[PDB]
Write an enzyme that holds these catalytic residues in place. Structure first.
Site, PDB file in Angstrom:
ATOM      1  N   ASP C  55      29.233 -26.903  -1.674  1.00  0.00           N
ATOM      2  CA  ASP C  55      28.381 -26.188  -0.733  1.00  0.00           C
ATOM      3  C   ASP C  55      29.128 -25.984   0.578  1.00  0.00           C
ATOM      4  O   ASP C  55      29.734 -26.921   1.108  1.00  0.00           O
ATOM      5  CB  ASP C  55      27.087 -26.968  -0.505  1.00  0.00           C
ATOM      6  CG  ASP C  55      26.111 -26.240   0.402  1.00  0.00           C
ATOM      7  OD1 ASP C  55      26.270 -25.018   0.607  1.00  0.00           O
ATOM      8  OD2 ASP C  55      25.178 -26.895   0.912  1.00  0.00           O
ATOM      9  N   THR C  88      24.320 -20.999   1.828  1.00  0.00           N
ATOM     10  CA  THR C  88      25.058 -21.291   3.053  1.00  0.00           C
ATOM     11  C   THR C  88      26.479 -20.748   2.980  1.00  0.00           C
ATOM     12  O   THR C  88      26.996 -20.210   3.966  1.00  0.00           O
ATOM     13  CB  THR C  88      25.073 -22.797   3.311  1.00  0.00           C
ATOM     14  OG1 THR C  88      25.805 -23.456   2.271  1.00  0.00           O
ATOM     15  CG2 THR C  88      23.653 -23.347   3.352  1.00  0.00           C
ATOM     16  N   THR C  89      27.129 -20.883   1.822  1.00  0.00           N
ATOM     17  CA  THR C  89      28.454 -20.299   1.640  1.00  0.00           C
ATOM     18  C   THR C  89      28.401 -18.776   1.677  1.00  0.00           C
ATOM     19  O   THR C  89      29.375 -18.134   2.085  1.00  0.00           O
ATOM     20  CB  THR C  89      29.058 -20.779   0.318  1.00  0.00           C
ATOM     21  OG1 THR C  89      28.773 -22.173   0.142  1.00  0.00           O
ATOM     22  CG2 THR C  89      30.575 -20.576   0.290  1.00  0.00           C
ATOM     23  N   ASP C 386      19.086 -27.807  -2.895  1.00  0.00           N
ATOM     24  CA  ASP C 386      19.393 -26.400  -3.119  1.00  0.00           C
ATOM     25  C   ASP C 386      18.497 -25.778  -4.184  1.00  0.00           C
ATOM     26  O   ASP C 386      18.206 -24.580  -4.105  1.00  0.00           O
ATOM     27  CB  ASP C 386      20.860 -26.242  -3.520  1.00  0.00           C
ATOM     28  CG  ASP C 386      21.811 -26.744  -2.450  1.00  0.00           C
ATOM     29  OD1 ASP C 386      21.330 -27.201  -1.393  1.00  0.00           O
ATOM     30  OD2 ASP C 386      23.040 -26.679  -2.666  1.00  0.00           O
TER      31      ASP C 386
HETATM   32  N1  LIG Z   1      25.784 -16.627 -12.700  1.00  0.00           N
HETATM   33  C1  LIG Z   1      26.170 -15.849 -11.661  1.00  0.00           C
HETATM   34  N2  LIG Z   1      26.876 -14.714 -11.861  1.00  0.00           N
HETATM   35  C2  LIG Z   1      27.269 -13.926 -10.843  1.00  0.00           C
HETATM   36  N3  LIG Z   1      26.994 -14.204  -9.556  1.00  0.00           N
HETATM   37  C3  LIG Z   1      26.291 -15.307  -9.206  1.00  0.00           C
HETATM   38  C4  LIG Z   1      25.830 -16.213 -10.266  1.00  0.00           C
HETATM   39  N4  LIG Z   1      25.171 -17.213  -9.655  1.00  0.00           N
HETATM   40  C5  LIG Z   1      25.205 -16.976  -8.319  1.00  0.00           C
HETATM   41  N5  LIG Z   1      25.873 -15.834  -8.053  1.00  0.00           N
HETATM   42  C6  LIG Z   1      26.111 -15.260  -6.702  1.00  0.00           C
HETATM   43  O1  LIG Z   1      26.554 -16.288  -5.812  1.00  0.00           O
HETATM   44  C7  LIG Z   1      25.901 -16.180  -4.546  1.00  0.00           C
HETATM   45  C8  LIG Z   1      25.565 -17.572  -4.023  1.00  0.00           C
HETATM   46  O2  LIG Z   1      24.777 -18.277  -4.978  1.00  0.00           O
HETATM   47  P1  LIG Z   1      24.705 -19.885  -4.942  1.00  0.00           P
HETATM   48  O3  LIG Z   1      26.036 -20.417  -5.414  1.00  0.00           O
HETATM   49  O4  LIG Z   1      23.446 -20.303  -5.665  1.00  0.00           O
HETATM   50  O5  LIG Z   1      24.498 -20.205  -3.374  1.00  0.00           O
HETATM   51  P2  LIG Z   1      25.558 -20.997  -2.447  1.00  0.00           P
HETATM   52  O6  LIG Z   1      26.540 -19.931  -2.026  1.00  0.00           O
HETATM   53  O7  LIG Z   1      24.708 -21.528  -1.319  1.00  0.00           O
HETATM   54  O8  LIG Z   1      26.157 -22.079  -3.314  1.00  0.00           O
HETATM   55  C9  LIG Z   1      24.674 -15.302  -4.745  1.00  0.00           C
HETATM   56  O9  LIG Z   1      24.590 -14.313  -3.714  1.00  0.00           O
HETATM   57  C10 LIG Z   1      24.840 -14.660  -6.111  1.00  0.00           C
HETATM   58  O10 LIG Z   1      24.959 -13.238  -5.999  1.00  0.00           O
END
Ligand SMILES: Nc1ncnc2c1ncn2[C@@H]1O[C@H](COP(=O)(O)OP(=O)(O)O)[C@@H](O)[C@H]1O
Ligand SMILES: Nc1ncnc2c1ncn2[C@@H]1O[C@H](COP(=O)(O)OP(=O)(O)O)[C@@H](O)[C@H]1O
Ligand SMILES: Nc1ncnc2c1ncn2[C@@H]1O[C@H](COP(=O)(O)OP(=O)(O)O)[C@@H](O)[C@H]1O
Ligand SMILES: Nc1ncnc2c1ncn2[C@@H]1O[C@H](COP(=O)(O)OP(=O)(O)O)[C@@H](O)[C@H]1O
Ligand SMILES: [Mg+2]
Ligand SMILES: [Mg+2]
Ligand SMILES: [Mg+2]
Lengths: 538, 541, 520, 50
Positions: C55, C88-89, C386
């Site tokens: 994160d 957050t990222t 999260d």
């Molecule tokens: N399985 C997936 N395939 C493609 N893009 C994804 C997938 N899961 C998440 N994302 C992308 O990653 C971004 C961040 O998601 P997430 O990792 O849940 O949040 P964080 O950046 O806080 O860890 C989202 O905007 C989404 O578009």
């Protein structure tokens, strides 16, 4: 125990020395493997003095950068002996030693002794020679075809510079060994070609010259730069004042003898130069469009330049030692030291001689020879590092094309020999084992360590190595289903198999010989090493 | 979890070695860092450019708007900058102007290629893209030529040649300095009905003698040269003989002496009495022969003895040292004589002619002037610079060296044809390359478009130094090329530049074809090397 | 000399150049920490611990940068974490690009840093419009879709393999804290950890989990229907507020003073036994004597319980915070307690309190975590924050935006199309907003190993023609629509990402000079 | 103007030609006044202060 002998000593034994040898080899491998192939990266050797130099050969990278680790010094010395005798394949040596120590250490951790592991490498090495002598192919070099030498030169020069400069420079390599050939004696010299460092239009604007090119110009303006027909004359004794060796001094009795004793030195200058003037008009007097040039190794008196300037004589000085052998090969003359005996037979011949003023210096160009047995290559560039980069490219490319004439056999490249040698070293049935369940561990380790070369090329191109090799082992197997010699390669443009032969990639026979022999020896001795020590008096 | 394991390849290469590879971020580190020095050459570009004061470690101060001269003295630790440094020096030792164009274009190709690398385009494809774009650029520049010159002799024809070059460096002085350089070239070139077969020209023909004090308008042209030297022996006649034969000696005028060392040996006193007169009669036999033919001037490179100077004073022969060897041969080209090392006596064929030699002070210091009228000269001229400060006169010398270097760039090849300047052909190349990118489908099309965007800095850099808005005159200039008349559109620099249109032929601003071709090639080769490297290996200090 | 300044004043254009390079450097640290194939990050704090996570917020908490422009970028993660709890990222990686794309212009085309701000608010106003149009509503009561909505964020973490259990774990926990608008808060969500065990047997249980055991051995370790009563006060005689000083004259006074110490603790214990409780939870410590007669009625005594753990017990058992013991009644006594039981674990004892399960105050709960080690517990605990953060946005806002970069790519296309019709001086910064919005799918393709040149070219060709729900499959690296892919995220996270990223650029773009070392 | 250099030798002057020669100027912009003063002293010999 060693501390009792010398408290200031140290020792790593039987587990810490093995990790040092493997980690230093893998650390040297991880840094230096990136230069392998045409898609490799360029390194900038920036020393403390600010000297910039671009290169991809592992010899010059390790020569400038001093090695602190004791293991990598042994690998750098192996690359020196590889680059010395051959001049190509240094990146394959460090990768094979790094992979052999990696694949061997995988089995040393499983509780296997290093002795039988190295015994399997030697049997696997001897088995590869029995595979290599059958894998090579013989060609007839008597035809002297240009198409084969170009594609063979293109395979070696693509690993140094990009494509557009390789196409301009690859005829220069093939033009280097045109006339240098002897069928009976089988003598072929590499040092006769002369590499001149100079700044000019661009690196991509270089060209080949048939004859010799010297870096010395005419001192006096009166002598003509353009000479339509020149007879060279080789001098080696210095025409200036040479103090009599036996200490001496001119003690004159009166002022009238001062200019006479000054004229005594003029007599010895006129004595040896009178034969030069007599040599000119001996051939033909009042002959327009026929000059007479003199090449001297030692200095020339500036007082004597007026004598050469009146008769329209080109005089150069401070020539190199190895150039004296190159004059007679290009111009067809004969070397002479003194001026006691002279004749028109000893004189050479030249069809065109001219000079060009480039910056604060002048370069002498001698071309249009009848049957020259030598030539030169002008290394033009836009900077200081491109000269060294193109110099290393030519010095590495001359050996690849020269080995084709030294031995007619040539191995296809593109990782064909490493892929084909992997299957042959899988199952040694009853040919050469030596023992039950002992030697075969080293046979498996040696077979798996040879396939890192085609995988390293794929890692530089940016594709998956296992996927592109799956169709490749496959291609070779389908080929086997036909009992035919279909040699397969690795194409880095699309990530698919290709024929090394058809496409245009080859390797020299002596590269793979010394590389496998040198890597197996260093990989064997480093596995046998069980303890590192240091001792001395500061 | 306090101390790291310290990177266990530390047994490998010593701590002084630094690796800055890619993936880690080398390209991002480099293209950026060099933006500081990119703004240095950008601010010093154009006629309104700002000169930069560079104080070296010795303390010799230099003030210049000439970029090259700058990077020679700057001790730059960054290795990627040094590729641009000596690449600019190649333009100096060869073409001689544009030092600043090759550095700006080479840096902008790296700056504009930020979009290609950041998007994820392969580095190998970018090199292939600019190389094919370089080939199309060289082929296309030949068609946009309208200045095919074949005379290259008269003075008024050089107004389209020298004055654009002089207008860049210190724009305020155009007519005065162009008169000095153009009149110098006319004295250099020989009088003939048709001089062809590539006549010889060199940068050492036109020299620069810097004199302290005096306004720039009071300068003049001298066919000979001027040395800061003290004459000895007598005052000149200045109109009596009407012409003077000048012998140039390499060896001195002294009782001749041997190489190996000797000394005086006297067995009896009879030789002691005659030794005082023997040295006088020895030189008299060699000096009397020189005066018979009427050699009214002698030049000896080494130190002249007092005994030889004494015999020359009574006959009224001019003496001069000229210790340096390079400037000794230039005096021979004026009179048209050859060096005669031995004292001897001479000959009519080897001795030249000089009209007159007069001595005065130009800036307080006594100097020797070799100006001659109605005489024959061949490849020799000088420009006497008068200025308030030595720091400003140093820039005038390099501006003249770049001006006469362009003459070497014209007469050495078969053609040094002109092109439209003032931001006219650069915007044309943007339209040519924009149309060329659509002809060849492929992944390399992005490299072709971004190669054209790098040429945008040439018009706006003239507008930025002019205190104008880039977003008004630059897009307005594109509307002028819509459609000869559209080719001669350029960037105006004046208070009435709100329209942004000024005809080129009113002031005759032009650039060289060979200069821009060599600049584009060295600029592309400079950007080719920086984008091709991935790992940079340093060392201690 | 003059005031404490003027060491090296970075003024003019070079000051903003360092800020764009410094702001870009923050995003480059966590460039690989995005997408389903994201890499982990182990940071070493100087105290002695270790933080293993991916994160961006938890990474940037431990890092320390000695630069004032990068610290404003550091604080944006606290804006996202303490607003929603997810993405957050995404906030840090988008802003870097916005500051970077606007830079060309600042450096070269000389657009003043205020005209860019005016261009961004109209882009911000249009960004909320297209994000409102691209999002589709979803039913809140559908548990089948809610499980797939919760596991969208879990897919980018380590526990995607246990996603079948985590969605059931998070869904039951959110509905417990949810109050019947629909406001919930994570302060009652107990993050108690148990090192060791398997993740499969880990389950949420209604109630609390203490770290302590009973005091006396004769206390009942298994009660059918506990009746909990919370106490704040010391149950023991205490010194008292004023300057006291008893002066003793007779010999029968000191034994009386020590006897009333026994009778006062009898008086407070006897009135507790008027209601006859089974479990008496005291906030402060307990005496050895009062506990003895708490035993003569059938109660159970515990050690000092911190305040926090009593406010959760008040909502579970329905009791009230009570300090004065004389005013103890039968109505404020906790009831409807399911079960009482104490398990043996080598670390410490653990007392379980189960609920009968059968409006009123919102109920609390404790989520059991059975990880592999200590870092695995802290890794999984942040995943629940999260994952449970996603469940709040669908209840507060029924809208649902597409994931996989389809939402931000939709902003890129409409801003790019409308930039042509926006002719003027604002066109160049307005068009540069689309250049950064198309990077958040570019980062997914780089982590997946594919070529983003042809994928983004194929993306824009199909986005206008095919549908508005097109996106990149992070695992396979091919174009797959979000409808068939079955992964969706809330629209609230997309709003905070666009708002916080643009609002951060408006602050940093106004920076002219940097002067360090003034005073404390 | 009374000037005393590091070598401790007095030198009194009224004109600005030798005053600026005694004071060894480090700044390049301040050396511009010194160069014109010596140039005016070398060419004409008056008005070095003006
Ligand atoms: N399985 C997936 N395939 C493609 N893009 C994804 C997938 N899961 C998440 N994302 C992308 O990653 C971004 C961040 O998601 P997430 O990792 O849940 O949040 P964080 O950046 O806080 O860890 C989202 O905007 C989404 O578009
Ligand atoms: N164009 C190519 N395609 C595939 N393989 C190549 C190509 N060029 C060289 N190689 C491979 O690279 C290996 C080393 O070649 P080279 O780089 O010239 O020597 P070095 O690694 O010593 O510089 C050879 O064994 C050859 O198989
Ligand atoms: N009066 C003028 N009007 C318009 N343009 C001018 C004027 N004077 C100079 N220029 C332009 O300024 C530019 C300066 O170029 P410069 O960098 O000196 O050339 P190079 O790089 O070849 O040395 C020229 O290209 C010229 O066209
Ligand atoms: N007798 C005078 N009456 C009025 N003005 C004078 C007189 N002498 C000189 N001046 C003026 O005063 C200035 C004196 O210059 P000054 O500084 O004294 O000499 P310098 O300029 O050589 O150092 C000059 O500009 C001159 O015009
Ligand atoms: Mg090679
Ligand atoms: Mg998330
Ligand atoms: Mg005065």
């Amino acid at each position: 125990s060693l501390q009792l002998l010398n408290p200031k000593a140290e020792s790593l034994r039987r587990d810490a020395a093995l990790k040092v040898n493997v980690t230093s080899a893998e650390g040297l491998q991880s840094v230096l493997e990136t230069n392998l192939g045409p898609k490799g990266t360029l390194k900038m050797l920036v020393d403390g003095a600010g000297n910039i130099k671009l290169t991809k050969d592992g010899k010059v990278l390790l020569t400038e950068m001093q090695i602190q680790s004791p293991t990598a010094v042994l690998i750098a010395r192996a690359a020196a002996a590889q680059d010395e005798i051959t001049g190509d394949g240094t990146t394959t040596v460090v990768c094979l030693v790094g992979e052999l120590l990696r694949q061997a250490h995988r089995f040393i951790q499983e509780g296997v002794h290093p002795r039988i592991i190295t015994d399997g490498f030697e049997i696997a090495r001897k088995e590869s020679m029995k595979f290599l002598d059958e894998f090579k192919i013989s060609k007839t070099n008597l035809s002297n075809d240009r198409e084969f030498l170009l594609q063979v030169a293109r395979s070696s020069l693509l690993t140094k510079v990009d494509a557009d400069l390789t196409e301009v420079l690859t005829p220069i390599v093939t033009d280097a060994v045109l006339s240098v050939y002897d069928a009976q004696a089988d003598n072929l010299d590499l040092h006769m070609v002369e590499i001149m460092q100079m700044q000019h239009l661009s690196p991509k604007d270089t060209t080949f010259i048939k004859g010799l090119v010297l870096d010395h110009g005419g001192r006096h303006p009166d002598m003509p730069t353009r000479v339509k027909n020149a007879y060279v004359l080789i001098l080696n004794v210095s025409l200036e004042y040479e103090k009599t060796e036996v200490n001496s001094g001119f003690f004159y009795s009166s002022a009238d003898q001062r200019d006479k004793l000054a004229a005594s030195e003029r007599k010895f200058v006129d004595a040896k130069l009178k034969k030069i003037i007599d040599l000119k008009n001996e051939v033909c007097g009042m002959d327009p469009d026929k000059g007479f040039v003199i090449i001297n190794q030692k200095g020339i008196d500036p007082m004597s330049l007026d004598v050469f300037a009146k008769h329209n004589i080109l005089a150069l000085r401070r020539a190199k030692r190895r150039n004296m052998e190159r004059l007679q090969l290009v111009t067809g003359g004969e070397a002479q030291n003194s001026v006691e005996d002279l004749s028109p037979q000893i004189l050479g011949f030249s069809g065109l001689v001219y000079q060009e003023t480039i910056g604060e210096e002048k370069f002498t160009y001698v071309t249009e020879n009848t049957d020259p047995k030598s030539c030169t290559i002008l290394i033009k560039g836009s900077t200081h590092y491109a000269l060294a980069q193109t110099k290393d490219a030519v010095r590495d490319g001359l050996r690849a094309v020269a080995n084709v004439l030294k031995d007619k056999n040539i191995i296809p490249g593109a990782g064909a020999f490493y892929i084909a040698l992997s299957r042959y070293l899988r199952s040694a049935n009853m040919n050469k084992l030596g023992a039950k369940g002992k030697t075969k561990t080293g046979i498996e380790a040696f077979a798996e360590a040879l396939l890192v070369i085609p995988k390293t090329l794929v890692k530089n191109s940016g594709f998956d190595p296992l996927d592109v090799l799956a169709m490749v082992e496959d291609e070779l197997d389908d080929a086997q289903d036909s009992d035919e010699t279909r040699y397969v390669g690795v194409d880095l443009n699309i990530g698919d198999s290709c024929d090394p032969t058809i496409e245009g990639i080859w390797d020299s026979y002596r590269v793979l010989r010394n590389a496998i022999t040198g890597a197996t020896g260093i990989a064997s001795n480093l596995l046998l090493c069980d303890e590192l020590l240091r001792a001395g008096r500061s | 979890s306090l101390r790291l394991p310290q990177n266990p390849n530390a047994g490998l290469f010593k701590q002084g070695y630094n690796s800055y590879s890619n993936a880690d971020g080398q390209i991002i580190k480099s293209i950026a860092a060099i933006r500081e020095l990119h703004q240095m050459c950008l601010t010093s570009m154009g006629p309104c450019g700002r000169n930069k004061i560079i104080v070296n470690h010795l303390g010799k101060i230099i003030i210049t708007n000439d970029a090259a001269t700058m990077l020679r003295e700057l001790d730059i630790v960054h290795p990627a900058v040094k590729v641009l440094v000596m690449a600019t020096e190649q333009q100096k030792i060869d073409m001689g102007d544009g030092t600043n164009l090759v550095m700006i274009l080479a840096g902008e190709l790296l700056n504009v290629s930020e979009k290609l690398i950041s998007m994820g385009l392969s580095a190998v494809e970018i090199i292939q893209g600019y190389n094919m774009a370089r080939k199309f650029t060289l082929k296309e520049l030949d068609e946009m030529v309208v200045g095919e010159i074949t005379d290259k002799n008269d003075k008024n024809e050089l107004l389209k040649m020298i004055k654009p070059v002089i207008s860049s460096k210190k724009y305020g002085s155009e007519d005065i300095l162009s008169e000095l350089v153009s009149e110098a070239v006319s004295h250099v070139l020989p009088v003939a009905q048709q001089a062809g077969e590539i006549p010889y020209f060199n940068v050492d023909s036109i020299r620069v003698v810097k004199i302290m004090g005096g306004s720039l308008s009071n300068s003049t042209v001298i066919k000979g040269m001027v040395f800061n030297r003290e004459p000895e022996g007598h005052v000149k006649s200045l109109s009596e003989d009407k012409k003077h034969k000048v012998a140039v000696f390499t060896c001195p005028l002294d009782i001749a002496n041997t190489e190996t060392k000797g000394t005086v040996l006297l067995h009896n006193a009879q030789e002691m009495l005659d030794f005082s007169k023997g040295e006088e009669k020895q030189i008299d036999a060699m000096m009397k022969e020189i005066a018979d033919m009427g050699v009214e001037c002698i030049v000896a490179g080494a130190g002249v003895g007092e005994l030889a100077l004494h015999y020359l004073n009574r006959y009224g022969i001019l003496v001069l040292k000229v210790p340096s060897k390079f400037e000794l041969r230039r005096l021979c080209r004026v009179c048209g004589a050859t060096p005669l090392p031995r004292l001897g006596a001479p000959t009519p064929e080897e001795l030249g002619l000089v009209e007159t030699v007069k001595t005065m002070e130009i800036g307080g210091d006594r100097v020797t002037v070799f100006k001659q009228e109605q005489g024959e000269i061949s490849r020799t001229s000088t420009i006497i610079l008068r200025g308030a400060t030595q720091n400003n006169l140093d820039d005038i010398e390099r501006a003249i060296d770049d001006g006469v270097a362009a003459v070497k760039g014209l007469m050495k090849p078969s053609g040094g044809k002109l092109l439209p300047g003032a931001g006219a052909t650069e915007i044309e190349l943007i339209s040519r390359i924009t149309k060329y990118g659509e002809r060849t489908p492929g992944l390399l099309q992005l490299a072709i478009k971004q190669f054209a965007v790098a040429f945008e800095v040439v018009p706006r850099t003239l507008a930025e130094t002019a205190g104008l808005d880039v977003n008004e005159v630059l897009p307005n200039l594109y509307a002028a090329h819509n459609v000869t008349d559209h080719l001669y559109k350029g960037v105006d620099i004046d208070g009435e530049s709100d329209e942004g249109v000024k005809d080129i032929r009113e002031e005759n601003i032009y650039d060289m074809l060979a200069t821009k071709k060599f600049a584009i090639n060295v600029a592309t080769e400079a950007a080719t090397t920086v984008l091709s490297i991935d790992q940079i290996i340093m060392a201690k200090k | 000399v003059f005031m404490n300044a003027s060491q090296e004043r970075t003024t003019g254009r070079q000051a903003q150049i360092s800020n764009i390079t410094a702001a870009k450097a923050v995003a480059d640290v966590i460039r690989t920490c995005l997408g389903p194939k994201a890499m982990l990050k182990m940071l070493l704090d100087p105290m002695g611990g270790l933080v293993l996570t991916n994160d961006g917020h938890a990474i940037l908490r431990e890092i320390d940068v000695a630069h004032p422009a990068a610290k404003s970028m550091l604080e944006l993660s606290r804006t996202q974490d303490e607003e929603v709890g997810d993405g957050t990222t995404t906030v840090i990686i988008l802003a870097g690009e916005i500051l970077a794309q606007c830079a060309p212009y600042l450096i070269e085309k000389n657009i003043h840093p205020v005209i860019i701000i005016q261009a961004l608010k109209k882009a911000l106003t249009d960004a909320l419009e297209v994000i409102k149009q691209v999002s589709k509503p979803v039913d809140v009561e559908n548990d089948a879709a809610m499980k797939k909505l919760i596991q969208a964020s879990i897919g980018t973490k380590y526990v995607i393999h246990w996603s079948e259990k985590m969605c059931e774990l998070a869904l039951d926990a959110v509905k417990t804290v949810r109050k019947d608008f629909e406001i919930d808060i994570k302060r009652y969500v107990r993050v108690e950890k148990i090192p060791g065990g398997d993740v499969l047997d880990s389950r949420v249980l209604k109630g609390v989990l203490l770290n302590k055991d009973v005091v006396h051995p004769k206390m009942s370790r298994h009660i059918e229907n506990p009746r909990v009563v919370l106490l704040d006060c010391p149950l023991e005689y205490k010194k008292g507020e004023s300057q006291t000083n008893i002066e003793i004259e007779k010999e029968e006074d000191w034994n009386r003073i020590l006897q009333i110490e026994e009778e006062q603790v009898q008086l407070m214990c006897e009135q507790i036994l008027a209601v006859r409780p089974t479990l008496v939870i005291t906030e402060k410590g307990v005496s050895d004597l009062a506990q003895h007669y708490l035993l003569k009625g059938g109660c159970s005594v515990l050690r000092r319980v911190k305040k926090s753990d009593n406010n959760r017990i008040a909502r579970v058992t329905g009791a009230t915070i009570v300090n004065r013991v004389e005013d103890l009644k039968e109505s404020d006594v906790g009831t409807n307690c399911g079960l009482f039981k104490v398990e043996m674990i080598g670390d410490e004892y653990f007392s379980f309190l189960d609920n009968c399960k059968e409006s009123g105050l919102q109920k609390a709960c404790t989520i059991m975590l059975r990880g592999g080690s200590k870092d695995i517990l802290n890794e999984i605990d942040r995943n629940l924050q999260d994952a449970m953060a996603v469940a709040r946005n669908v209840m507060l806002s029924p809208s649902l935006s597409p994931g996989g970069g389809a939402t931000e790519m939709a902003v890129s296309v409409k801003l790019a199309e409308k930039a042509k019709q926006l002719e003027g001086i604002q066109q160049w910064p307005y068009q540069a907003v689309a250049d950064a919005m198309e990077c958040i799918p570019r980062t997914l393709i780089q982590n997946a190993g594919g070529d983003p040149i042809r994928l983004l070219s194929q993306l824009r060709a199909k986005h206008a023609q095919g549908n508005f729900t097109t996106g990149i499959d992070g695992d396979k690296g091919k174009i797959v629509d979000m409808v068939s892919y079955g992964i969706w995220e809330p629209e609230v996270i997309k709003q905070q990402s666009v708002k916080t990223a643009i609002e951060s650029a408006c602050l940093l773009l106004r920076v002219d000079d940097i002067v360090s070392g003034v005073r404390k | 103007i009374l000037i005393v250099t590091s070598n401790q030798k007095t030198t009194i002057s009224n004109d600005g030609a030798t005053i600026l020669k005694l004071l060894d100027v480090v700044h390049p912009a301040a050396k511009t006044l010194v160069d014109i003063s010596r140039a005016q002293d070398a060419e004409v010999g008056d008005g070095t202060t003006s």
